[PDB]
Amino acid sequence: MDRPYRIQEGCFVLPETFTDRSVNIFILEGNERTSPSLNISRDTLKPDEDLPAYIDRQIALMKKNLGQHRVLSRAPAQAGTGNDALMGEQIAATHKSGKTEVYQRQAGFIATPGKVLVFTLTSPRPFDDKADLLWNTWLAGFQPDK
Amino acid sequence: GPLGSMDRPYRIQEGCFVLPETFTDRSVNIFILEGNERTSPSLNISRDTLKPDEDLPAYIDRQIALMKKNLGQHRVLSRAPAQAGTGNDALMGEQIAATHKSGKTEVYQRQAGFIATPGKVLVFTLTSPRPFDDKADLLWNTWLAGFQPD
């Protein structure tokens, strides 16, 4: 009933019954207003919900909650390079925060049954080659557990 | 290079990846624990940096000041040393116990801070609907002692 949970700093036990609402956040501190930021978040699939339907649901939420949200592209995505790589989808989108036009990539994967793992890159400027390389190397370098 | 870089491996429950050195980790772990009470118990793990000339007790002092602003009827009930892990890798820190009113409901809060990663602070914050008694303190401090630093 106790099972291990790992963070960067070490590891501890949690009851099997827990729900993980952790959000990993990585920023270039002091230069947030020009630099991309990275985010990893977690979610659970609704009954009979597959990953495409999950992404549709999230797209509709962002249309609802964010400023003038617009999806720019949608394509397959992969986290890792081995036979155990996560196979999922990604979108690119923009939305408005005050004067700023925020640019985002988000990639969703079912890492274990019923549980979605979401990688997000957020930039205060349109994507450039540097941001694209960051995004693609981040996903390719991911090493799934187990 | 092929054997490593100034960039740093980073681990989450679901796997690991390389985090470029320029990034600061501001992750917030949130775990909703099992419970049938009106409010669920939860564990929060956050990361912080000490301000210039701020030690760990002073850091705790700063977090209490922020609690008073955001949480209804916040009262500190206890303050004591804390230990995360055991053996040579054990982390010596500090902790508080406190109460506040989440809604119309009284809940019970622990916060324990440590210097796990050199030059950073790791903060465990427990929110529970169940009052702290000797048994609860035992189970909490025993759980802290079981932490295995990386």
What 3 state SS string does chain A have? CEEEEEECCEEEEEECCCEECCEEEEECCCCCCCCCEEEEEEEECCCCCCHHHHHHHHHHHHHHHCCCCEEEEEEEEEECCCCCCEEEEEEEEEEEECCEEEEEEEEEEEEECCEEEEEEEEECCCCCHHHHHHHHHHHHHCEECC
Query: Considering the domain boundaries, does residue B40 fall inside one?
Result: yes
Query: Considering the domain boundaries, does residue B3 fall inside one?
Result: no
Burial B91-120 (b: 16+ CB within 10 A, else e): bebbbbbbbbeeeeeebbbbbbbbbbeeee
For residue B51, give the CATH number of its domain: 3.40.1000.10
User: How many residues in total does chain B contain?
Assistant: 150
Nearest CB partner across the interface for A10, out of B15, B17, B150:
B150
Q: Hey, is the C-beta of B97 within 8 angstroms of any chain A C-beta?
A: no
Q: By the 8 A CB rule, do A54 and A38 touch?
A: no
Best CA proximity match to B15, nearest among A24, A29, A74: A24
Residue B125 has φ and ψ, to the nearest 5°, of: -125, 115
Experimental method: X-ray
Strands (E), B33-84: 42-48, 75-84
Is A20–B31 a contact, with Cβ atoms under 8 angstroms apart? Answer: yes
Query: Considering the domain boundaries, does residue B23 fall inside one?
Result: yes
- Separation of alpha carbons A11 and B139, rounded Å: 17
* Domain hosting residue A41, numbered range: 3-141
Query: Considering the domain boundaries, does residue A22 fall inside one?
Result: yes
Query: Considering the domain boundaries, does residue B130 fall inside one?
Result: yes
Q: Hey, is the C-beta of A101 within 8 angstroms of any chain B C-beta?
A: no
Query: Considering the domain boundaries, does residue B98 fall inside one?
Result: yes
Query: Considering the domain boundaries, does residue A146 fall inside one?
Result: no
Tally the domains of chain B. 1
Would you give the distance in Å from CA B94 to the centre of its chain? 10
Which long-range CB contacts under 8 A does B74-81 form with residues at least 24 apart? B74/B98, B74/B99, B74/B100, B75/B99, B75/B100, B77/B132
- Separation of alpha carbons B54 and B52, rounded Å: 5
For residue B81, CA distances in Å to B48, B97, B139, B141, B144 come to: 19, 11, 16, 10, 12
Name the DSSP letter for residue B134.
H
Query: Considering the domain boundaries, does residue B2 fall inside one?
Result: no
Q: What resolution in angstrom units was achieved for this structure? A: 1.8
Residues B31, B40, A16, A13, CA torsion sign: positive
